Amino acid sequence: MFASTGQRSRGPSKFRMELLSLPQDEWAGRLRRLLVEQASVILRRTIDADRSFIEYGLDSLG
Amino acid sequence: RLPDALRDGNRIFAVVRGTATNQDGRTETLTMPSEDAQVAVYRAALAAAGVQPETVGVVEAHG
Numbered sequence A: 001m002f003a004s005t006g007q008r009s010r011g012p013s014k015f016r017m018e019l020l021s022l023p024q025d026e027w028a029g030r031l032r033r034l035l036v037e038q039a040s041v042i043l044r045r046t047i048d049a050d051r052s053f054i055e056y057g058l059d060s061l062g
Numbered sequence B: 001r002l003p004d005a006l007r008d009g010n011r012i013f014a015v016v017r018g019t020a021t022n023q024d025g026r027t028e029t030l031t032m033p034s035e036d037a038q039v040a041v042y043r044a045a046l047a048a049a050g051v052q053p054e055t056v057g058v059v060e061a062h063g
């Protein structure tokens, strides 16, 4: 009967704890994916993981 | 022109002997300054004025 839940109960960064649990090599990939996602969100366009943010227009405010 | 000013005996406050212009190029951002470009324009001004940096004792920076 509970079906599902989606409430904003994230609070503390479970991302940080899950990365800490994961081996340090994995930390690079997870951080890479998080940064790519957030930068694509803020710059409104998808990005490459190696192209400079400068060539993506990341200004001072960005 | 300083020779003409001396020739006509006009009031002279000070003489400028060299001016230089330089651009930072592609810095980190659109407003980021370049230390290397500033040093380059300083060298260009010194060369154009025909004078040594040790001679100058007062510097009026952008600040």
Ligand SMILES: *[C@H](CCCCCCCCCCCCCC)C(=O)NCCNC(=O)CCNC(=O)[C@H](O)C(C)(C)COP(*)(=O)O
Pocket: A059, A060, A061, B029, B031, B032, B033
């Ligand atoms: C000159 C400052 C003059 C600014 C005047 C703003 C006028 C508004 C628009 C005029 C419209 C004209 C009408 C035409 C139709 C100056 O001496 N610059 C100050 C020194 N310049 C710099 O060093 C840049 C200053 N640095 C910053 O504050 C940062 O770069 C910023 C704010 C961009 C943020 O960080 P980001 O660089 O990481």
